[PDB]
Amino acid sequence: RGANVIWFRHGLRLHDNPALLAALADKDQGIALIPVFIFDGESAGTKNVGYNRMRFLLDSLQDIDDQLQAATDGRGRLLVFEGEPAYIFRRLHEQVRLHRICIEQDCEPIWNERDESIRSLCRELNIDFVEKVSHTLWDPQLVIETNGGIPPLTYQMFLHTVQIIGLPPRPTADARLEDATFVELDPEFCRSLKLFEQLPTPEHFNVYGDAKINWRGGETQALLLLDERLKVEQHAFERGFYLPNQALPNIHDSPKSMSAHLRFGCLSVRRFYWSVHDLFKNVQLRACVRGVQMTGGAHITGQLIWREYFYTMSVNNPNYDRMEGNDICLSIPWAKPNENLLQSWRLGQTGFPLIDGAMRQLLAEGWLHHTLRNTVATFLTRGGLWQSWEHGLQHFLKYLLDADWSVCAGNWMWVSSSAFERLLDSSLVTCPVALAKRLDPDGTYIKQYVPELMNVPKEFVHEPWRMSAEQQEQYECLIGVHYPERIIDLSMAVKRNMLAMKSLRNSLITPPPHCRPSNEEEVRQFFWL
Amino acid sequence: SSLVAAMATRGANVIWFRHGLRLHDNPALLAALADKDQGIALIPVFIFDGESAGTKNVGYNRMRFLLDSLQDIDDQLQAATDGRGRLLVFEGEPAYIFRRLHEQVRLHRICIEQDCEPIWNERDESIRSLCRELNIDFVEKVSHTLWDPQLVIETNGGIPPLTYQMFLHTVQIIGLPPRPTADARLEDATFVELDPEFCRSLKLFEQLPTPEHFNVYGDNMGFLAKINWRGGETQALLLLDERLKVEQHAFERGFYLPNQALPNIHDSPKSMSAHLRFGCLSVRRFYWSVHDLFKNVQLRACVRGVQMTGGAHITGQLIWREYFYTMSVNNPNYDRMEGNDICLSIPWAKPNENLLQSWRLGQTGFPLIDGAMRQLLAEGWLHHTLRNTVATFLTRGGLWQSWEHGLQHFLKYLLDADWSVCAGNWMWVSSSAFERLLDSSLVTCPVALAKRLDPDGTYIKQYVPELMNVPKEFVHEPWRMSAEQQEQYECLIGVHYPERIIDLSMAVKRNMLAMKSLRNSLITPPPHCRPSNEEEVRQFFWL
């Protein structure tokens, strides 16, 4: 008689799951395992959630529920409550002696509230509150400690800091559950506690869907996708170094990316980090990818450090997502919220096809290539529009499949509020024609995602306002009618904003310490230039 | 002076210079000095073979380089010996010169630096064998190359690596190369007083010569635009710090050489190519200054398509050097197309002497080609991307002349012109028929390329001066001018500045076609000197 609980919030996986393991630690003393998930209305980024990420979270629970079953032939499952947690955990500690509560660390400041709650309840009830660090690569408190009590605000720094520290920890053992106990619960208690019998739908949490590809959630599609990119990169690794001739940014590639699986924990990063690191494990690959050296996997590792970069940066700053109250975001003076502009930016009716391609794929699918996160974000902010970033942030945070709080704001702040990196204000990295013309030359993407534009020939599709009236007749696209005339004059805004940025840039000659590109080179790579 | 009679029999060591023109990381020198206690004096000798120090096929520019390069060491010596010791320059025959001098004084050792290039095995052995005869030690030390090429070749199982990739793999088993040797002690060394009659009979120079003494003439097919270089290990050493500094900046600076790390052709005289070519500068020293500067730091940036960390972006360039020399040691047909097991045999079209004689002159009508052949003639040195366009102009990239032609023109007028290095590059660039990318106009055409390397006509006007007046629009592709613009800018195609010699469009298609036409036959490529991959190609031009 006893029971330990693995309580998922982001772990969402069975491997390199250290708290999944601490909870099996006492299998021998007949100690039962309770797989718990709780929809407390905020957890797992379900406070501000669109329909697509919400489908994904249930896939991933669908997965772990299955997994748990078919390893103990229908014995234990995953229990999903819709509830308050500090309150659910109490009742269930009244129904069965509750030994340890096991959790993966959720460093983002916001979970510091919720988590506190039970941290306490355990104190209050004398329950071992188990917290294993495994969502991040390191223990962000060492990074912040090592760098002298404050998280590095620059990529160069962070790197230099985790190079003082060791390499990262390694994926903890595969979890053993074939031989393990399972809490059976008085069915009144289940009904009474709101425990689902049938895993819910978006519809149940009042989330509805208003799509040319899409994403399967969970640890499983996750490990699949890891081996598919692991191969293709061995294939490169092997074939001398090279990656063609096609390690330049293709936007119309598969549902390839593991970004939202990392965001929900479906895939350990320490797995990802090390399955790469191994694969290369020395061998001296003289050759780069995105301007980044590529020997030692240094090119695809780095990406996982970027994720670590922001997460870590955000640990003690709960204003991380806002502008004021936030000491590491420059106070740039964005203009007045223009709900008719904004509504244009969200709907993808701006008249700039690529942005409209990119904004519409976002809604329909919930995921967008790194280069496209750029163009749409710098378009909204400092690429003029010149509208503040907290607006592309609350939008992205809703309709993205990954949309990690720290990460999302991080990239947003970095990209739009670094007034000192002058390369960023160059329309050579801003303008979404001379770049759509590049990223998707035949208008194949644009036409996938902005269909009012099927019939426009490849001469016009990047810039259809060039079309003659007769041509607009002949191709079904009448600007102002079918496709919205440009919502702004870039020439005029581009300059408008530069001058505006210059202004501010000097009105303080010594920048304050903010979150920033580390140098122009790091801008080139962070943009694919 | 007195009983100098004793010292004659008492002994002497020769340190015989040919390449390795330097007093540092010159172990063959330290070798001679190894008997300072025995009372053995040093004899620093250089000799005008007829060949040796690449003098067989020389022009004014390199010849002069080789001399101030010698004036250097000569002073270098007196400098450290209050005029006591001096360098001795005989124009004569090695084996014979040495034999004589031996009677003048006992020789315990004759010390030289190695010379793997097969051309010298004849000259060298001559002495290897003379020492055997007079019971003199023939001392021979490897420097000039990074490694011992025989050990390089030994590892690749007896054949020399034919591909850059294959090369580093090989030298990666064999560890890092030897470190530079200690600085030399000449301050407290003895020297030799020769009988002045003997000095005369052996043609030993009193005053260091002019190129003209060797019937070498500072015309250079009629030329002198300029901004030139000087030889000497001092000069070399000067230039290594000068570049070194910069690198450290890029090193300290968050990696990257900033956006002017793309090739600038109107940069200065900076290149140490001609100094490592004459040993004026130790390659071992170049590599470990770089490798030291970068020791332990991870900086992820490329340059280059080559990583930057651990100096491996600059370190590699001396490995490129290593790659050709070492690949030539045992193949004395290296400079030739036939009898060369490693140069694919390729049906180059008959010599068109009018074509050649215009390629060498810079009268093609395609400026940057003209710009560069004329830089060659004028100055003696050419940027890499430049050597390329002109080599691919002559051979495969329009014109279809054998690479053997370009080679011997290049060996007449290059300040470096290593032998192995030159021919290798020439074959490697012109004869690699299975790398299709080299065929594409996108590295072939000199017009699209002049537009990228020399944007505003700067260079092309510096060197193709008949075109100072064409604007910038028409400067690059000046055949576009109306009859009156030509009247106007005082350059009328034909008169004034050559009408093109070939039809690139027509010729490039032709050439590619034949390269396919060759590629099919012979389905499976015969092992040859070729790039590792298409990515190597990319880094080897700048692209």
Ligand SMILES: Cc1cc2nc3c(=O)[nH]c(=O)nc-3n(C[C@H](O)[C@H](O)[C@H](O)COP(=O)(O)OP(=O)(O)OC[C@H]3O[C@@H](n4cnc5c(N)ncnc54)[C@H](O)[C@@H]3O)c2cc1C
């Ligand atoms: C305005 C803006 C908002 C963004 N919001 C998010 C977000 O909410 N969540 C998110 O994870 N990424 C976000 N990104 C960053 C990035 O575009 C994605 O991580 C990337 O598209 C994921 O696909 P990938 O797996 O092919 O990339 P890869 O290049 O394959 O790298 C693998 C993983 O590295 C990590 N990574 C790569 N780039 C970054 C980066 N710049 N910052 C942090 N981690 C990185 C991600 O986990 C990524 O999945 C945003 C970028 C911008 C400019």
Ligand SMILES: Cc1cc2nc3c(=O)[nH]c(=O)nc-3n(C[C@H](O)[C@H](O)[C@H](O)COP(=O)(O)OP(=O)(O)OC[C@H]3O[C@@H](n4cnc5c(N)ncnc54)[C@H](O)[C@@H]3O)c2cc1C
């Ligand atoms: C047709 C042709 C002929 C050439 N002939 C010669 C020659 O006779 N001698 C010569 O030294 N270089 C030769 N090169 C190679 C190269 O162009 C020069 O080494 C380079 O221009 C030297 O300038 P650098 O010192 O700035 O280059 P760096 O990039 O500073 O490298 C330093 C040194 O590395 C060596 N190195 C660099 N590239 C190469 C290369 N491709 N092959 C071999 N060694 C290399 C040279 O010693 C060079 O000085 C030739 C190139 C071509 C295309």
